[PDB]
Amino acid sequence: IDPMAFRRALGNFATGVTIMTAQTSGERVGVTANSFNSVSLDPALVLWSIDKKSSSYRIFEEATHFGVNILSAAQIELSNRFARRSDKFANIEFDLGVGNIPLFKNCSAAFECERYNIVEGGDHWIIIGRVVKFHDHGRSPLLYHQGAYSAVLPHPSLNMSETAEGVFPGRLYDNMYYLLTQAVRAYQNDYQPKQLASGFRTSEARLLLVLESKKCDLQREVAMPIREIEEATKILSEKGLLIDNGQHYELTEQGNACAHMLYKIAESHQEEVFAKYTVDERKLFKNMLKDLIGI
């Protein structure tokens, strides 16, 4: 099967973002990884897949301990730093655990592991580690879905019911916070099928909407790692929507049209339901939304 088409199919499985750290001596490594997952509770075992050609596996193989840093939603810069080969720990504060495990700050969780055993896994090494100490902080996590960073949309869905007061799960869910998250649910249920029908994934749409206006700068605006940007710009170039002459990325006439239609789709739901309101009422709704954001 095609490796690229398979990697893009794996993007449907949303995961968190972890950073695997280890230190021997003074040799230190930091690898951003999303192949992490749990295995067993007794004993406490976790695994993750590291590339066989990664220049960091030698230090993971030499060190007796490695750490799993569950990144929070406010650690996108920390994810991109430990995502490209480099002194990755330059100007990066961290603490040391058992086995000199580099532990970062403001993380959602951390798992200090002893190296349990390594297993063959195709073109990767499956590193199994025994958790000897963990940290449960509970901060809002960072997501990685379809090659783009996202966040978790909280609150359970509402019963779409019998009574007007029975729509909410409880009587206390009639709050502004719950109404905002459920408005995004109803909006996402209307926009996502329309974007998918046009053959655009999340990585493709974010680049069309950004490049239509005006690699590190682009990485910080679309919230996508460099590896996913290079992958998506290639796909957009195959569809005749982008030209990568070597200097920068520019959308074609065909690319600018697709970016504007994605704007029409993201506005079709609000324009369809707010048609009964006046122009001043719709303008007030945006001004009150900006007051919630802070702009």
Q: How many CB atoms lie within 10 A of CB 97?
A: 20
Both tokens of 237, joined, read: 């170039």
**CA 289, 292, 295: angle at the middle one, nearest 5?**
80
Within residues 160-199, the interface with ligand FMN by CB under 6 A covers: none
CB-nearer residue toward its own copies: 92 or 223: 223
Q: How far is the CB of 29 from ligand FMN (least distance, A)?
A: 7
Nearest to 235 by CA among 7, 1, 14: 7
Does 56 help bind ligand FMN (rule: CB under 6 A)? yes
The residues near 185 (Cβ < 8 Å, ≥ 6 apart) are 153, 157
Number of residues that bind ligand FMN (CB under 6 A): 19
Size of the site for its own copies (CB under 8 A): 133
Q: Which residues pair with 164 in a beta bridge?
A: none
Any idea what the Cα angle at residue 177 is, between residues 171 and 178, rounded to 5°? 50
Q: Residue 25 to residues 45, 60, 114: CA-CA distances in angstroms?
A: 26, 13, 17
Q: How far apart are alpha carbons 42 and 49 in whole angstroms?
A: 21
**Residues between 215 and 254 with contacts to ligand FMN, criterion CB under 6 A:** 225, 227
Residue 231 · residue 147 · CB < 8 Å: yes
Q: What Cα–Cα distance (Å) separates residue 123 from each residue in 38, 64, 219, 259? A: 21, 23, 27, 37
Choose, by CB under 8 A, the member of 211, 229, 232, 235 that binds its own copies.
211
Distance separating alpha carbons of residues 127 and 61, to the nearest angstrom: 9
Which tokens hold the place of 282?
A: 């719709």
Tell whether residue 145 is a contact of its own copies (CB under 8 A).
yes
Pick one of its own copies, ligand FMN, none as the site partner of residue 54 (Cβ within 5 to 8 A by kind).
ligand FMN
C-alpha 112/C-alpha 93 separation (Å) is 17
Q: How far is the CB of 176 from ligand FMN (least distance, A)?
A: 29
The binder of 104, among its own copies, ligand FMN, none, by C-beta within 5 to 8 A per type, is none
Among 58, 64, 196, 215, binds its own copies (CB under 8 A): 196
Q: Which of 96, 132, 97 minimizes the C-alpha distance to 116?
A: 132
- The partner in contact with residue 254, picked from ligand FMN, its own copies, none with C-beta cut-offs of 5 to 8 angstroms by kind, is none
Asked whether position 94 contacts ligand FMN by CB under 6 A, the answer is no
Rule CB under 8 A: is residue 238 a binding residue for its own copies? Answer: no
The piece of 59-67, 83-91, 166-174, 228-236 that touches its own copies (CB under 8 A) is: 166-174
Among 7, 9, 14, 55, binds ligand FMN (CB under 6 A): 55
Segment contacting its own copies by CB under 8 A, of 21-29, 58-66, 236-244, 262-270: 262-270
Site for its own copies in 7-36 (CB under 8 A): 7-10, 12-16, 18, 34-36
Residues in touch with ligand FMN (CB under 6 A): 17, 31-35, 48-51, 54-56, 82-83, 85, 144, 225, 227
